[PDB]
Each structure stands twice: as structure tokens, then as C-alpha cells.
Design an enzyme around this catalytic site. Structure first.
Site, PDB file in Angstrom:
ATOM      1  N   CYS A 272      30.461  46.517  34.028  1.00 53.03           N
ATOM      2  CA  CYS A 272      31.863  46.953  34.156  1.00 53.03           C
ATOM      3  C   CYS A 272      32.699  46.254  33.116  1.00 53.03           C
ATOM      4  O   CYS A 272      32.309  45.092  33.090  1.00 53.03           O
ATOM      5  CB  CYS A 272      32.543  47.032  35.644  1.00 53.03           C
ATOM      6  SG  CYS A 272      31.455  48.008  36.659  1.00 53.03           S
TER       7      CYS A 272
ATOM      8  N   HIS B 224      38.750  45.717  39.884  1.00 46.44           N
ATOM      9  CA  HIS B 224      37.853  45.307  40.826  1.00 46.44           C
ATOM     10  C   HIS B 224      36.988  43.922  40.623  1.00 46.44           C
ATOM     11  O   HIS B 224      36.417  43.491  41.462  1.00 46.44           O
ATOM     12  CB  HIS B 224      36.904  46.370  41.384  1.00 46.44           C
ATOM     13  CG  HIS B 224      35.651  46.690  40.565  1.00 46.44           C
ATOM     14  ND1 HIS B 224      35.652  47.691  39.630  1.00 46.44           N
ATOM     15  CD2 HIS B 224      34.444  46.176  40.355  1.00 46.44           C
ATOM     16  CE1 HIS B 224      34.425  47.808  38.968  1.00 46.44           C
ATOM     17  NE2 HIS B 224      33.782  46.584  39.425  1.00 46.44           N
TER      18      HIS B 224
ATOM     19  N   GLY C  85      27.331  44.611  36.818  1.00 43.38           N
ATOM     20  CA  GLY C  85      27.984  43.596  35.803  1.00 43.38           C
ATOM     21  C   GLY C  85      28.430  44.247  34.584  1.00 43.38           C
ATOM     22  O   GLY C  85      29.021  43.646  33.687  1.00 43.38           O
TER      23      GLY C  85
END
Ligand SMILES: *C(=N)[C@H](C[C@@H]1CCNC1=O)NC(=O)[C@@H]1[C@@H]2[C@H](CN1C(=O)[C@@H](NC(=O)C(F)(F)F)C(C)(C)C)C2(C)C
Ligand SMILES: *C(=N)[C@H](C[C@@H]1CCNC1=O)NC(=O)[C@@H]1[C@@H]2[C@H](CN1C(=O)[C@@H](NC(=O)C(F)(F)F)C(C)(C)C)C2(C)C
Lengths: 306, 306
Positions: free
Chosen positions: A145, A41, A143
Site C-alpha cells: 500500500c 490506513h 505492505g
């Protein structure tokens, strides 16, 4: 003496963290050899995340649309590939700090350390367990991830988790390092149910053995039970069923303390049926289920790593 | 979302750990520049530790009686000095992995990370607080002495603790990196009392603000209090007195949530006077006091380090 939630030393993983940017989205990546692994993503805008078609979104991306930064130095991207929910960016430089490593898919109940990162930089480290419903109880902000979960066996880092999203109950979801989610979760911003969170019975018993080793044994009663009678009680309290495999795994701790696993099960039953009456066990007022029998043996023996 | 006890990334400290042996006693040392710091009881036998005269014991030791090992390579000892309860061994090689560092003496209530070590090798990392009675609630076995406590401000490691001993209540005692004990403890194997363990009030309030930020706010009541009325209640429960300095330190969290510190004090009072009625706050059934207001801001903001 003493018993605390302990994370593995994070130095080997710190040397692998990089920052990955694609357009206006930045997140963490894991740089091992000449490949950078990150959540797919990274190619999504806030709008795309509502119902993304990752294959169509990725087709409009070239190698030069991925900025990979290690500290202040830019890595050159020479290839890219989508593997399930992870994006693999081939770079022209092998990480000189690559430790000995393997990718593993852990089972529910198993624990690991997380090195929480923001913009490719380390923020902190904590210990988590993969819940039976395949969620983790972590601490992650926007943030985070790309942050990874790992275990360490002497000098080998076993990467087992990569952080992707937060579910509505406050718990977290992610994949193994092949990009396959733990659980039925998808990388889309839509309502997703985790399912009933059950207690990791073999871990609670391990932690009760840790309490005994540390001199905290008020809870030990004069009863014993059977596996089937314990499981009838455990299932009422949403505890995972105990099997003969779990009894065998508890073997070292049972032999160290002289307390048979079924005797410890009877004391657990009384704690579930009567509560703790304002008392604590290892400084906790709840039954702790995020210490595996291996974690208990390791902390009680002082196992070290390179 | 989520709130966990988080340790600082330990990579910078891992590169500083060495093994120090003197005769038959081995423990951990901290190698910064051309000096190795370790607990002075490395020169003691089991018998000596009962009533040691460190000055006489050290006088029978030369540079060559101290074996310092970094991995598999031996460091040459060219000088030695006793500074309070720490022994400083001057070596002929400056540690190439020395980070930017400072030595600090922390105050009671302040937190830090511990990298627990055995034989100079890392075993794990956890977060601790210096209790108001100058003890820590750690997890240490025989041979863990020399393990250090530290904080990290972006790229600078502030070393604040070195582990020396365990007290009869299961808690631990140690020194700053100048060898001065925190508390009235001495490095002798004799009965030693820690004194009443009081709760770090400003930390509990910080953790209540962390709960509010995370959506856990069942405990918020319709009352307010005064500093003097709160302290009359707090002292009954062995809570440290709250001052206007603690109120100011809580300022960012008070402003973020819109909850005045004295309103949060009134909710704390009701929790102390009524218990939690089987409920939890951030997954805990007890009031947590090992998160400073700074730790709460850091975890809720995602502060990173080099
Ligand atoms: C990646 N940095 C974030 C980390 C999130 C932000 C809050 N705490 C975290 O762990 N991941 C996301 O924003 C992912 C991402 C889209 C949506 N998302 C979510 O975590 C959302 N969750 C869900 O929609 C749900 F409930 F299904 F899990 C959010 C509502 C923002 C918490 C994608 C691609 C999954
Ligand atoms: C150093 N590796 C050990 C670490 C201890 C062992 C158990 N858990 C720990 O933290 N330190 C010691 O053995 C120190 C050492 C002599 C005695 N000692 C103790 O910790 C003893 N404690 C005390 O006598 C007391 F209560 F005063 F704190 C022990 C009984 C072994 C726990 C010296 C030089 C202080």
C-alpha cells in the site's frame, strides 16, 4: 518488430518513494515538494481495519507519531491532514528529486505503470489498466500500500493511482492522489463486490492493429459490420460498447494499416464467435485488452521521454 | 495475490544512457565510469552492413568522428577500442551517476529487464528471457541498438545484454557487455537462422508453483511421474530436458506448496497432452516460460532493491 507490455522508465518515481510508519504499521509514501502522500490506513492496527472511524483514529495522532524515512534519513513532520482516503504529511524538507508532476484522475480503460514498493523501497515495475469495473489486475502483497501508478509525457510524471487494498477475486483497488477511490470501494476490511469485469473493446481493436503492423494477420476476414451489429455481439461477450469516439481514437492505426475500424470489428466478431482454434496473435492465446490505441502508436513509433 | 511480468526499477540504468553518433548513424551507448560501450555497427552505413569488414571500417575512424551526447552536453572522446562486437569509447569524464555494476554472461533460460532506448533516451522497460536458442522476444525498432538488459541485486546492476539486431522470425539477437554474441549470430545483414525454439521447462514448473501459491490449482492431478518418463514426453513437445539441478532449484517452491516436483511434472504432462480446454492459469491460455524459479520466489516474497 515485436510487441510487449512495456512500463514507463521508473527513475523519476523511484526518487519520490519514502517509508511511512505510524505506531506498528509501515507502508509506502510519495514525497513531492514538502508533502508526503500515503494511504490513511497507516494509522490503523489490524483490529481497527475491520470497521475504522478514521476521523476518531486520526485525532489521537500528532505530527511526532508519523515517522517518515527516505533511505536512512528521517524527515521531520510539521503538519498532517486527511484528504478523503489519503493522509498528507507536511515535512520541513522539499524533495530535491521532485520531478515535474501533475495529479490526474484516469478513465476506465486507460493504462499506467505501477512501481511496486515495500518499506519505501522499489521492488519492480509493471503496466496495468484501470478495468471498466475500476479494479486493476496487479501483483501486491501486504505492505505494498502506498505504491503508485503513473504515466509520463516527455519529462512530466502524471500520478494517477495509489494502492490501497485487494478484493476477494484477486484484483486490486485504490485511489487517485486526492484520495478518492476508483470505484465503489471503501478502505475497510469487509466483503466488497467489484461487479462484472467487461473487456475494453477499443483496446482489443488497438492490439489487433498492432498485430497487423507486426505481420500477424491470419485473423483478418472478408467481412465488415456496422457499429450497432458489432455491439449486439460484443454485449453478449461482456465487451464494452464501441462508440464513434473510439472509432476516431483508432484513426491513426486505421490509416496506417488501410483497415477500416468496422472491418476490424467484423474480424473481432468472428474471433469471439469461433475462438482462435489453437492459434495465437502476438504470442497470446487470448484477446488482449490492456494496450490503449496510444500505447500501440507509442510502441510502434518509439516515443521517448527525458 | 496476483502474478505479473515485472521488470526491475530502471533508474540506475537511465542515468547511464547516452547517444552515440558516427557520421550519419546514431544509436544508444552505456556510459559507466569513463567508458561508453556501444554496438560496433555504429561505424557502418546502410550499405556497409551488407558485408562489413569492421577492422577496415574502424581504421578510417578517429576519436573526433564519435559524437557522444548525454542529454544536451557533449562528452569528449579521448580513445577508442573494438572488443569483439562492441566499441568502447574512452571519455574524459567519469559518469557521476555510475551505479555499482558488474558485467555478466547469463545462461539460456535466465531472465532480465530491458530498458528500450531511442537516441540515447528511455522509451520503456520490459522483462525478457534468453531463449534456449539464444534469441530474445523483445520489441525493438530501428535505432534501438545499444539498449541494454540487466538484473539488479539490491544496489548492484548486473549488465548482461546489449541489443544489436532482429532475426527473420521477429526475435532479437545481441551480445554480452564484452561484445560476444549470445548464439551463433553475426553483426551482418545476411540471412541467419535461429534454430528450434524450445520451452524452458524449469520456468514453466516455477510458474505452475506461482499459480498454486495464488490459489489457481485446477490443473493439479492425482498422478506422479519419473524424470526419465517426463523427459520422454517433454522432448516430443520441444521442452528442454529436466535435470536434478532444476529439481533442486525448484526446492523452495516445492517446500512452500507441499507439492513434489515430480507430481508437478505429471500435471504438466497432462496439460501438454490434453491442452487447457479453454481454461486459463494466472490469466494466461498458454504455458508461460519466462519466469525463473528465482523470479517466482522474489515476486511472492516482495524482495526490494536500493
Ligand atoms: C496494504 N498493504 C494491504 C495490501 C493488500 C494485502 C494483500 N494484497 C494487497 O493488496 N491492504 C490491506 O490489507 C487492506 C486494508 C484493510 C484490509 N485490506 C485488504 O486488502 C483486505 N481486503 C478486503 O477486505 C476487501 F476484500 F474488501 F477488499 C484483505 C482481505 C487483507 C485482502 C484496508 C484498510 C482496506
Ligand atoms: C539497430 N538499431 C537495428 C535494430 C533492428 C531494426 C529492426 N529491429 C531491430 O532490432 N539493427 C539492425 O538494423 C541490424 C544491423 C544490420 C542489420 N540489422 C538487422 O537487424 C537486420 N537483421 C538481419 O539481417 C538478420 F536477419 F540477420 F538478423 C534487419 C533485416 C534490418 C532486421 C546489423 C549490423 C546486424
Amino acid at each position: 518488430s515485436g510487441f510487449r507490455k512495456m512500463a514507463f522508465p521508473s527513475g523519476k518515481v523511484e526518487g519520490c518513494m519514502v517509508q511511512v510508519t505510524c505506531g506498528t504499521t509501515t507502508l509506502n509514501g510519495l514525497w513531492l515538494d514538502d508533502v508526503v502522500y500515503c494511504p490513511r490506513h497507516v494509522i490503523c492496527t489490524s483490529e481497527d481495519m475491520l470497521n475504522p472511524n478514521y476521523e476518531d483514529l486520526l485525532i489521537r495522532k500528532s505530527n511526532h507519531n508519523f515517522l517518515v524515512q527516505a533511505g536512512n534519513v528521517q524527515l521531520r513532520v510539521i503538519g498532517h491532514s486527511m484528504q478523503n482516503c489519503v493522509l498528507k504529511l507536511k515535512v520541513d524538507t522539499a524533495n530535491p528529486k521532485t520531478p515535474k508532476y501533475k495529479f490526474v484522475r484516469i478513465q476506465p480503460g486507460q493504462t499506467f505503470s505501477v512501481l511496486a514498493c515495500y518499506n519505501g523501497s522499489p521492488s519492480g515495475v509493471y503496466q496495468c489498466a484501470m478495468r471498466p469495473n475500476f479494479t486493476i489486475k496487479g501483483s501486491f502483497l501486504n505492505g505494498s500500500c502506498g505504491s503508485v501508478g503513473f504515466n509520463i509525457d516527455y519529462d512530466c510524471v502524471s500520478f494517477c493511482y495509489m494502492h490501497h487494498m485487494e478484493l476477494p477475486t484477486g484484483v486490486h483497488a485504490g485511489t487517485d492522489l486526492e484520495g478518492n477511490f476508483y470505484g465503489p470501494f471503501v478502505d475497510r476490511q469487509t466483503a466488497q463486490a467489484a461487479g462484472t469485469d467487461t473487456t475494453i473493446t477499443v483496446n482489443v481493436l488497438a492490439w489487433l492493429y498492432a498485430a497487423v503492423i507486426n505481420g500477424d494477420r491470419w485473423f483478418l476476414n472478408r467481412f465488415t459490420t456496422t457499429l450497432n451489429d458489432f455491439n449486439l455481439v460484443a454485449m453478449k461477450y461482456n465487451y464494452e460498447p464501441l462508440t464513434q469516439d473510439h472509432v476516431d481514437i483508432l484513426g491513426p492505426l486505421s490509416a496506417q494499416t488501410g483497415i477500416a475500424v468496422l472491418d476490424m470489428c467484423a474480424s473481432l466478431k468472428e474471433l469471439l464467435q469461433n475462438g482462435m482454434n489453437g492459434r495465437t496473435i502476438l504470442g497470446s492465446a487470448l484477446l488482449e485488452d490492456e494496450f490503449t490505441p496510444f500505447d500501440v502508436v507509442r510502441q510502434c513509433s518509439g516515443v521517448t521521454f527525458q
